[PDB]
């Protein structure tokens, strides 16, 4: 119900509507902040 088409590797937050990848984390924008999985 919120499509996220791209994945970006960058040490800084790229965009609301992408998924931020650091070294061993996957942060995505939800609830006004960046929550990581796992």
């Amino acid at each position: 119900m919120k499509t996220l088409r791209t994945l970006k590797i960058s040490p800084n937050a790229p965009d609301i509507n992408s998924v931020w990848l650091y070294k061993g984390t996957m942060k995505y924008f939800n609830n006004g902040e960046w929550e990581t999985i796992g």
């Binding site: 119900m1 919120k2 939800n30 609830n31 006004g32 902040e33």
Partner: protein
């Protein structure tokens, strides 16, 4: 204002009781007169320019005579408790725009299609609790709905602290963020307000409203944000303006049909009711039928208004002057 009638209505203000036709000395007194044979009832009222009697009620042709207090003629100002839906989010989320739409439904016309839509909005941030939200939204509505530029008073908005839970701290457009100093706010009450009133030209009316909420994204699905429950009313508009607009209408049955039309040339009919006082109303609704084949009835009614001092003293003494004189059981209120 202009009201409907069952073929006539005439009003007599009962400011004082004298019980005899010789003591009618000042303006606005009443004497309910009847003879010993209980067949004719009339009211001799001392007008500002002489003694004027009423239509002679034939007591076998009355229909209903019921007297109404002044707490039943007060339009209660309804309230609306605007809160966060705690099933949606207990605390405000740090990204979304929290916008509340008030849907007014009778703004300058009479019809539900003359609408008006006013708003207030908070951008909620990180660490902003609910009490800092309700502090930040009641100012965001008071800059809109209780501002000094607006044509009419739309609503009266308030805040409620959870420790007090009964008294309201009123917020105005001039109220700063440091005036509302409470960490335990829990709701925002939006109340209807008293619209303006002019004697005879602008009646007493009210503009209704419904607080409606805009959708925010929680998780990934756009949900509604708030809930709005109707709190029982606390403020009531008094009876002063509905009776002044009723007397101003009903003086024209016994008097000039035009009221001020053409102003070098008007007849100043002096009005006796105070718009700053609460009034009790008694209506005796009767008719006329002749002893012939003309058996169709001509309905009439007489409205008696009297000042209320809180315990209905002037009206219950007026009813007792009618019941013993005429032999009807008008119920004391």
């Amino acid at each position: 204002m202009v009201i409907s009638i069952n073929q006539v209505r005439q009003l007599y203000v009962a400011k004082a009781l004298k019980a005899n036709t010789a003591a009618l000395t000042t303006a606005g007194d009443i004497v309910p007169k009847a003879d010993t044979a209980k067949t004719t009832l009339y009211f001799q009222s001392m007008s500002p320019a002489g003694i004027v009697a009423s239509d002679k009620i034939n007591l076998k042709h009355v229909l209903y005579a019921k007297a109404t207090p002044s707490e039943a003629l007060a339009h209660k100002l309804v309230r609306y408790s605007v809160t966060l839906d705690a099933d949606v989010s207990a605390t405000p989320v740090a990204g979304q725009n929290y916008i509340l739409r008030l849907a007014f439904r009778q703004y300058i016309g009479l019809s539900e299609e003359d609408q008006y839509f006013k708003y207030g909005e908070v951008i909620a941030r990180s660490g902003m609790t609910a009490s800092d939200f309700y502090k930040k939204m009641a100012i965001s509505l008071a800059k809109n709905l209780e501002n000094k530029t607006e044509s009419t008073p739309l609503v009266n908005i308030y805040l409620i602290s959870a420790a007090a839970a009964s008294t309201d701290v009123p917020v105005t457009s001039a109220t700063k963020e440091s005036d509302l100093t409470a960490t335990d706010y829990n709701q925002i009450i939006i109340e209807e307000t008293e619209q303006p009133w002019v004697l005879g030209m602008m009646p007493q009316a009210f503009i209704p409203f419904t607080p409606q909420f805009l959708t925010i994204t929680v998780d990934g699905e756009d949900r509604l944000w708030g809930v709005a429950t109707v709190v029982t009313p606390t403020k009531t508009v008094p009876d002063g303006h509905l009776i002044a607009d009723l007397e101003y209408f009903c003086m024209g049955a016994r008097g000039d049909i035009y009221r001020g039309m053409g102003y070098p040339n008007i007849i100043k009919t002096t009005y006796l009711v105070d718009p700053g006082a609460v009034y009790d109303v008694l209506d005796i609704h009767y008719f006329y039928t002749g002893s012939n084949e003309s058996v169709q009835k001509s309905e009439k009614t007489i409205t008696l208004v009297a000042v209320d001092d809180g315990s209905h003293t002037a009206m219950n003494a007026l009813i007792g002057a009618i019941n013993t004189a005429s032999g009807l059981t008008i119920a004391t209120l």
